[PDB]
Every structure is written in C-alpha cells, then in structure tokens.
Design a protein around this nucleic acid. Structure first.
Ligand SMILES: [K+]
Ligand SMILES: [K+]
Ligand SMILES: [K+]
Ligand SMILES: [K+]
Ligand SMILES: [K+]
Ligand SMILES: [K+]
Ligand SMILES: [K+]
Ligand SMILES: [K+]
Ligand SMILES: [K+]
Ligand SMILES: [K+]
Ligand SMILES: [K+]
Ligand SMILES: [K+]
Ligand SMILES: [K+]
Ligand SMILES: [K+]
Ligand SMILES: [K+]
Ligand SMILES: [K+]
Ligand SMILES: [K+]
Ligand SMILES: [K+]
Ligand SMILES: [K+]
Ligand SMILES: [Mg+2]
Ligand SMILES: [Mg+2]
Ligand SMILES: [Mg+2]
Ligand SMILES: [Mg+2]
Ligand SMILES: [Mg+2]
Ligand SMILES: [Mg+2]
Ligand SMILES: [Mg+2]
Ligand SMILES: [Mg+2]
Ligand SMILES: [Mg+2]
Ligand SMILES: [Mg+2]
Ligand SMILES: [Mg+2]
Ligand SMILES: [Mg+2]
Ligand SMILES: [Mg+2]
Ligand SMILES: [Mg+2]
Ligand SMILES: [Mg+2]
Ligand SMILES: [Mg+2]
Ligand SMILES: [Mg+2]
Ligand SMILES: [Mg+2]
Ligand SMILES: [Mg+2]
Ligand SMILES: [Mg+2]
Ligand SMILES: [Mg+2]
Ligand SMILES: [Mg+2]
Ligand SMILES: [Mg+2]
Ligand SMILES: [Mg+2]
Ligand SMILES: [Mg+2]
Ligand SMILES: [Mg+2]
Ligand SMILES: [Mg+2]
Ligand SMILES: [Mg+2]
Ligand SMILES: [Mg+2]
Ligand SMILES: [Mg+2]
Ligand SMILES: [Mg+2]
Ligand SMILES: [Mg+2]
Ligand SMILES: [Mg+2]
Ligand SMILES: [Mg+2]
Ligand SMILES: [Mg+2]
Ligand SMILES: [Mg+2]
Ligand SMILES: [Mg+2]
Ligand SMILES: [Mg+2]
Ligand SMILES: [Mg+2]
Ligand SMILES: [Mg+2]
Lengths: 27, 46, 77
RNA sequence: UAAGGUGAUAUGAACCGUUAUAACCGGCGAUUUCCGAAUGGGGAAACCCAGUGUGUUUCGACACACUAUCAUUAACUGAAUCCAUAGGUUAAUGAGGCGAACCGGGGGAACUGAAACAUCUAAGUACCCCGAGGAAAAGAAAUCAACCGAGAUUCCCCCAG
RNA sequence: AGGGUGACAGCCCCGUACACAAAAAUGCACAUGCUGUGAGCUCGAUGAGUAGGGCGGGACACGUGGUAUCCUGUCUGAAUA
RNA sequence: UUUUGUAUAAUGGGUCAGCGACUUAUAUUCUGUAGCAAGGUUAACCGAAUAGGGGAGCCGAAGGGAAACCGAGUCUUAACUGGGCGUUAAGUUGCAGGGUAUAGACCCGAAACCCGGUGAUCUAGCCAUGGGCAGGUUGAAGGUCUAACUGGAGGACCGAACCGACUAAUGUUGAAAAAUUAGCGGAUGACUUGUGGCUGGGGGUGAAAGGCCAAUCAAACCGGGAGAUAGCU
RNA sequence: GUUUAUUAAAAACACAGCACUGUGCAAACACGAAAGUGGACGUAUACGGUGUGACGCCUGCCCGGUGCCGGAAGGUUAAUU
RNA sequence: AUGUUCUAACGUUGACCCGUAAUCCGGGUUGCGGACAGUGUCUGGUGGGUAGUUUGACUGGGGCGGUCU
C-alpha cells in the first residue's frame, strides 16, 4: 500500500497504525 | 380404562385456539387453508 | 446474517464433488471479519462486518466513499 | 319506473300505495356494534383493563376523540466525554394484513428410469421462502455472421430429434 | 335467437331485429388552460477491485473433455480508444 | 381363473340393480382408400372467411465413400481377372386402420422413499405449584464399657385407602378393542396424585423392553411429489 | 426399586460400592449453520464417559493383533510453487 | 525460514463508566492476551457419527460343496 509519510507498506501497517495515528495518508 | 381424550378447555385453547394459530406463520397458513376450504369453524375457539 | 456490509457478498450454495463425482450440497461462506475502521472525518471508529475483499475495496476507494455508499443503500453502520 | 307493495321457508297479522317521497331498479351520499393486520396495554378471537385531553354533570357519574410498531424526514432535547456522537421526546409521511393463477428471485427433494446401482436420470420438477405487476421479465450489441452481410428484446412456425 | 303459457305458438305473454334514453358518478379518445419535466446546437467525456488470472463450484444442449463463453465463494489483478 | 392336468377337497363370486378396464396427444412405419403426380404438400401467420393467400420448410426424383471427393456410378487397392454398395420398381399429401415410440399408456393393488405441516389432553422423562398415605408393630443414633430408663431411626415390618399386576377361572361376535371374580406385590418413598408447563420424528423420551411419543412405532400422524414403481397376482 | 400400556416381572434394567478414563473452567461433553444454552451461578473431595455391581476373600500370565497414549531420527506424502 | 521483543489489527465468558429502572447489547476507559487464537477459501488425514447402495446364477427345495469360457 502506497502512503505519504506525514510525520510502500504492508496494508495492515497502513490501515491499523500509520493512517489512524496520523503518521501517514495513502498515496 | 383411561382413554386418550382428557378434556381441558384451557389446554384446548392454548394448543389449538385462534390466537395460538395466529402466533406463527404456519398457524396462519392453517387458517388460510381452512378459509379457502370454506370451513364454518376455523378453530376450536368457536 | 453472514453478509459483507461493503460488497453484499453472502453464502452461496454449490456442490461438494467426490472423486466418484457424487454431488452433495454445500455452502461457500464469505471471508467475513468484524473490523474497526478509522473515519478521520468523524474522528471515530466505525465497526463494519466486511469480507477480506470488502477491506480491499475500502483500501482502494477510501472509508468515506464506502460509508457514503452504505448510507445511500440504507445499510446501517 | 310504477299499480301495486311490506326478501325466503310461510301462511297470517297490522299496514302502505294507485299520478306520484308505496314498493322496485340505478348513481351519489349517510349510518356501519364487536372480533380480525387489529394498532392504547393485555388475552384462552368476538373478551378483560387503562392513560391523556376536551366537553357535560343532577357529584352518582357521563360523552367524544386520541394514545401500537417500524421506516423516512424535521424539530427540540441530549451520555460516558471537551466539541460532539449515541440516546430521548414530539410532529409529518409511508408501510403492515388478505388474495386462484400467471411473473422475477432465494433455497431445493425423492420415488422413478438406467431392466441392480453410485456417475447420469427424475429436475432446477414437487415443495418451502422473499418480492412485484396488470402483466412480469427481457431489451437497444464489448450481438451474430463470414470477407457477403445482418441490426434491441419478446412470442410463434421451421431448422431437427 | 331464446324462454314461458293446462300437449309442440313467428302472430297469447316475456322477449328478439330495429330504433331510442341519463339527474348522478365514472372509463376512454380528443381539444384547450395550468404546475413541474426541461428541446436543440457546438464542445467534451466514455462506468476498476472492474476485465483477465489461480483455486473451488455452478450455468451454458455441452457430464472437464482438446473446451471456447457466462456467473462467482476464495486469493489476485490490467489496458482504459 | 390358473394349469401338464381341476367335479375337484385349488382361486373368485350371498343375490340383484347401477357403475367398473386397450384410451388420448404427438411422432414414426406398414396396409386400405382418395387427390395430385416427377412431383406432392404447405407451417406459423394473414384472412370475418372450413374460402383464398402464405412453399419458410418437409418428403421424393442418385448413389458411393469415414471423408475430401467423385457421380450412374462409386468405394476398395499400386491396379483389379475383381469384389461391396448402387444404377434399368413413383412419389407425396390427406382420411380410416394395424404396429412401434414418448407420455400413468388396459384397469385395480404394495411394502416403501422424499417434501411441508399437525400432534406430549395417551404415554416417557423433566420443570413449577398444590394434595394423599386408616390402623397396628419393631425400637437405630442420641439423651439422662455396661445397666435401667428415655428416645423415635428406617428406599424397616403387618395391613386398608392409594399405586401396581404374580397365579387361576371366566370372558374371547365380551359387560370390556385388555376386563371381571378369588387370591397376589408395594403401601414415608428411587412413593403416589391434581393443575399447568417443556422436549417433535432419524427427532424426542427411555432404572433399556426397540419400550413409549393420542386404541398407530425397527422411524408418528396429516397433506403433498402421486396415477412412485410392481419382469408379480 | 425398574421393565416389554395389550401373551415375558425375570436370572433382565437400576442400585450403593469399585475401577479406568477424560476434563484447569470460555472445562470436557451435549443441544444448536449461529447467537447462545445446559454442564454450573458447580471448579478436580468437581463434572462427563465407560465397564463392573452390597459385602467377604480376591482379581494370575500375555502389549504379537486392533485401539489409545507418548516419541520424532529416517522413509513416504496434499494444496501451493 | 525459526526465535525474542513490541502494539496498533483481533480476542476477552477481568475491572470500572455511560446509554439505563437493564444481570442482554453497544459505546467508552483500563487490565490481560496478541499477530497468537479464531473464522473464510483451498488442502492431506481421520470419519458406520450419518447417508445411499451392493452383496450372481445353475441347483431333483434352499443352503453348504461343485460348476460357469
Ligand atoms: K436416485
Ligand atoms: K429396474
Ligand atoms: K313461443
Ligand atoms: K476476479
Ligand atoms: K398351481
Ligand atoms: K387353499
Ligand atoms: K399409424
Ligand atoms: K396413403
Ligand atoms: K463395381
Ligand atoms: K397415392
Ligand atoms: K398404449
Ligand atoms: K420419521
Ligand atoms: K415381579
Ligand atoms: K498393542
Ligand atoms: K482491550
Ligand atoms: K492467527
Ligand atoms: K463412517
Ligand atoms: K435336477
Ligand atoms: K426332490
Ligand atoms: Mg394487541
Ligand atoms: Mg386493542
Ligand atoms: Mg405489501
Ligand atoms: Mg433402477
Ligand atoms: Mg418491466
Ligand atoms: Mg462490414
Ligand atoms: Mg302432458
Ligand atoms: Mg464503456
Ligand atoms: Mg470476458
Ligand atoms: Mg473472473
Ligand atoms: Mg479462462
Ligand atoms: Mg475457473
Ligand atoms: Mg463447472
Ligand atoms: Mg400344479
Ligand atoms: Mg374331469
Ligand atoms: Mg382333488
Ligand atoms: Mg364339496
Ligand atoms: Mg372350488
Ligand atoms: Mg391364488
Ligand atoms: Mg369365496
Ligand atoms: Mg448422396
Ligand atoms: Mg417399607
Ligand atoms: Mg407398569
Ligand atoms: Mg383383584
Ligand atoms: Mg415386603
Ligand atoms: Mg404392606
Ligand atoms: Mg431384542
Ligand atoms: Mg399407542
Ligand atoms: Mg425410513
Ligand atoms: Mg413423480
Ligand atoms: Mg399405484
Ligand atoms: Mg422387589
Ligand atoms: Mg406384556
Ligand atoms: Mg405379566
Ligand atoms: Mg458456559
Ligand atoms: Mg453386570
Ligand atoms: Mg449403513
Ligand atoms: Mg434409490
Ligand atoms: Mg437393496
Ligand atoms: Mg438361485
């Protein structure tokens, strides 16, 4: 899953941590 | 000797009465069949 | 019921087939999971019962678009 | 429309009417108990018991209307929890139940045939379930054809056992 | 036509052919008012967890067969004139 | 009727009256008959039309070969002296009939299998809430190692009600689709009983007999698949 | 005590007692496509299953077969790739 | 590819708060587990627990024996 770091990953890393914690958003 | 029919009006009405028939879809189908046949007495109630 | 809230995937029927081609009825169930989705626009978690396929749909389309579809179908969340 | 009439078994009684409110026929209205989706709560159907509001009362009571549930929408209110959201309340709109077939969909046998039987058959039939309409469904080519062409869907006869 | 009448009726009776009729409600087909629906013309645009694939099933007259095509429970996954 | 064979003491029929079994549809073949004839005939449909239109088709006038293909021939084979099938028999459409096919397919008849319902008012187990057990015995623990006295245990004892059902006789088109009479077992308990409740059919329940689940049980009843199928009578 | 209501009441079933065995609790186990519910508002001195059947004296030898329990060197072996 | 650690998916039939008159359910807070468990699809094993069935004929009755070209 492509993400923009705000602070390619496994979909679960994005879905359940990075995006909810406000650390990234999808590309 | 004790025979099979031992009448109780309360048990009769609870087992087979109008409201017992109306309480389930299959009981309502009984009433629909008996209305379609043209029964004078739909249930044991009356 | 075993229904994906995103895709509407539900149990379908088919056959088990033996080596001797004996057919017995079976079901195929969706790969359903209850999952808490972060909805940034509401600052809230929304739990959906979703197929694994529905989770890929959410990843692609985004949770806001999917929940918009859910509201317009009368699908309560 | 009328010289007759008050449905039947079914006579009688007491009457109504004969130039037009006798009766009879048709249109539109009025009335329309109780049970039943039954909907104010309950219930062993045709019963038992309420709340609220008006109005009447001769103080004993009395009448009438409203009060189900769900969905949607709107307003107001409103947690854990800050904003909130869930929740709550009221109003409006709709639904609900029934019905022979036909129709679309979700499920789906077995006997039987195979001269046994398991693949296969019976058959996507019977049956159960959901939903609709006067019909339904389908439908305007990511279709066929064969280098020539056709031009959505549906139904009938062929092609062909 | 048909039915009735004390046996079998064109002319006894009720009808029948034919010719007419609506205060009221209502179907329909027109015409003409009114509310919303908004024609036409240049210029774009052209349906993605989709098509396709692997696994399991089902549907196609077609039983997996050398098996196209359709549907999809599961895992994937394009090009987009 | 069935049989090698029936007066047969094999089957069926008490009698009468009424009803009761080779059908229908569509395909296909053959026969008869009618029409037309190297042709015959139309289907749906159009038509107010039993008319008329409609020849899409179908059958026939050519076969041989697996086929390409060739064609009164063709196939076989490298090729036939040959050999196989063909060539010198009129068909076709109605109408009637015989047979066949698919359909319940001459009629009646299973035991069963499947699907959806109805049933625990009988009975089995359980749940809740009420009731019942005359009369008479025995004398545990305990109490005040043994004595007296006291005490009142028990799936304890004898025995009515009550619950059962061991034996015999009767009855067996019964008084009764399970009883009556004389005797018999339990009778404070793992007891018995009223009312109500719960468990549902490959399911229940069973101190277990395949017992019981409404006079039905090695898979209830009712309706449906259904005219199941029946090489049998 | 129980049993074949309606030809069997028994030596059959049950039984207290005994043993094996499972079960650490969201127990095993059972009814349920599931949610749940029983087990149990119990917790190994408990609960389920199995066999035996008061009590007394006892209960010998066999683990090759079939189960069950434990093991994991080696062989073989699925989808998948 | 195995192992440790982590928390954020997921589990909780621990505690507490709220909806709330509620021992269901949901939301919240927190503890404990934790990428395990569990579920879907696929797949090997096991599977009279359950189901559909098969289990020949001749024969001096049938069976047993014998036989079947
Ligand atoms: K079958
Ligand atoms: K057969
Ligand atoms: K006449
Ligand atoms: K796909
Ligand atoms: K004979
Ligand atoms: K005889
Ligand atoms: K014929
Ligand atoms: K002929
Ligand atoms: K020749
Ligand atoms: K002829
Ligand atoms: K026939
Ligand atoms: K049964
Ligand atoms: K006895
Ligand atoms: K052993
Ligand atoms: K937690
Ligand atoms: K896991
Ligand atoms: K088995
Ligand atoms: K012989
Ligand atoms: K003999
Ligand atoms: Mg009510
Ligand atoms: Mg009411
Ligand atoms: Mg409706
Ligand atoms: Mg057969
Ligand atoms: Mg339509
Ligand atoms: Mg072209
Ligand atoms: Mg006469
Ligand atoms: Mg397009
Ligand atoms: Mg395609
Ligand atoms: Mg695909
Ligand atoms: Mg393909
Ligand atoms: Mg495939
Ligand atoms: Mg297939
Ligand atoms: Mg003889
Ligand atoms: Mg003779
Ligand atoms: Mg003789
Ligand atoms: Mg004689
Ligand atoms: Mg005789
Ligand atoms: Mg005979
Ligand atoms: Mg006789
Ligand atoms: Mg030819
Ligand atoms: Mg005693
Ligand atoms: Mg008894
Ligand atoms: Mg006696
Ligand atoms: Mg005694
Ligand atoms: Mg006694
Ligand atoms: Mg036996
Ligand atoms: Mg019985
Ligand atoms: Mg059976
Ligand atoms: Mg049938
Ligand atoms: Mg029959
Ligand atoms: Mg005894
Ligand atoms: Mg007996
Ligand atoms: Mg006896
Ligand atoms: Mg529990
Ligand atoms: Mg024993
Ligand atoms: Mg078997
Ligand atoms: Mg069968
Ligand atoms: Mg058999
Ligand atoms: Mg034999």
């Amino acid at each position: 899953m492509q993400v923009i770091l705000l602070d390619n990953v496994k979909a679960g890393y994005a879905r359940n941590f990075l995006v909810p914690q406000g650390k990234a958003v999808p590309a | 000797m004790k025979r099979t029919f031992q009448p109780s009006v309360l048990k009769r009405n609870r087992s087979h009465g109008f409201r017992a028939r109306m309480a389930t879809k299959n009981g309502r189908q009984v009433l629909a069949r008996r209305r379609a046949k043209g029964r004078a007495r739909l249930t044991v109630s009356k | 019921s075993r229904v994906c809230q995103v895709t509407g995937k539900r149990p379908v029927t088919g056959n088990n087939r033996s080596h001797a081609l004996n057919a017995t009825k079976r079901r195929f169930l969706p790969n359903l999971h209850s999952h808490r989705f972060w909805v940034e626009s509401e600052k809230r978690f929304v739990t959906l019962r979703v197929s694994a396929k529905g989770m890929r749909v959410i990843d692609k389309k985004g949770i806001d678009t999917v929940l918009a579809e859910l509201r317009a179908r009368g699908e309560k969340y």
